[PDB]
């Protein structure tokens, strides 16, 4: 599974 | 004053191309991923493709896997879409959307795509 | 693909009076993080769509405290206490969880006066 909430954006 | 502006809509004929663009500003374009949104008129809602903050993966809708293509410019702050083989099907309004709050927090003004012989 | 049920089509309410809009989807929008990914959204005549709510109940930026979101699990519920002028238009409902990115059919709003 995928966050596409979490995922597409940049890593913190 | 977080605003998305979309260009490139218009008409074209069956099979033929088009490509859309998405202005971004107000935040910081290379750190958040981007959608594609299109709505026929009259209809409803439906998603299309999605990209990485720095374009490294993409998923696109099955409807149009092998026909649509997601790019991004983040030195120019631009989000485009690349639609080849185009049907009537295809027409609608077509947004952009930024990805935030766990959501889709903000979106284009819609640009128009028209398919007819 | 997650179905996302909205319910009904059209939604006669008077100005003034409470409104409620009903999403239903297909499987659980609860993430393996413990987070409902659903949202809410309006879209005025002939305007692009605007975030409401974000994971069921929470308000988005500039959103009146009149919209209220409740629900959790695959039923869920956008409230309005008092409907207002500048609530006409379709709303919908949106999940997050999945990737397969699903809308569902939305909810117009129709005000009577």
């Known amino acids: 599974n995928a966050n596409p909430n979490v995922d597409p954006n940049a890593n913190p | 004053q977080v605003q998305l502006v979309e260009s490139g809509g218009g008409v074209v004929q069956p099979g033929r191309s088009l490509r859309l663009s998405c202005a971004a500003s107000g935040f910081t374009f290379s750190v958040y991923g981007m959608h594609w949104v299109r709505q026929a008129p009259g209809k409803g809602l439906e998603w299309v493709a999605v990209?990485?903050?720095?374009?490294?993966?993409?998923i696109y809708a099955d409807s149009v896997k092998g026909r649509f293509t997601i790019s991004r410019d983040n030195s120019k702050n631009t989000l485009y879409l690349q639609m080849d083989s185009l049907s009537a099907a295809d027409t609608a309004v077509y947004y952009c959307a930024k990805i935030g709050s766990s959501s889709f927090d903000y979106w284009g003004q819609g640009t128009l795509v028209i398919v007819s012989s | 693909d997650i179905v996302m049920t909205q319910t009904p089509l059209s939604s006669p309410v008077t100005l003034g009076q409470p409104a409620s809009i009903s999403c239903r989807s297909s499987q659980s929008l609860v993430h393996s993080n413990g987070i409902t990914y659903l949202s809410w959204l309006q879209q005025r005549p002939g305007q692009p769509p605007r975030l409401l709510l974000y994971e069921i109940s929470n308000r988005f930026s500039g959103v009146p405290d009149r919209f209220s979101g409740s629900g959790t699990g695959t039923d869920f519920t956008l409230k309005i206490s008092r409907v207002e002028a500048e609530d006409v238009g379709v709303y919908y409902c949106?999940?997050?969880?999945?990737?397969?990115?699903?809308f569902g059919q939305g909810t117009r709003l129709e005000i009577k006066r």
């Open positions: 990209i990485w903050y720095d374009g490294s993966n993409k």
């Open positions: 949106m999940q997050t969880t999945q990737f397969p990115i699903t």
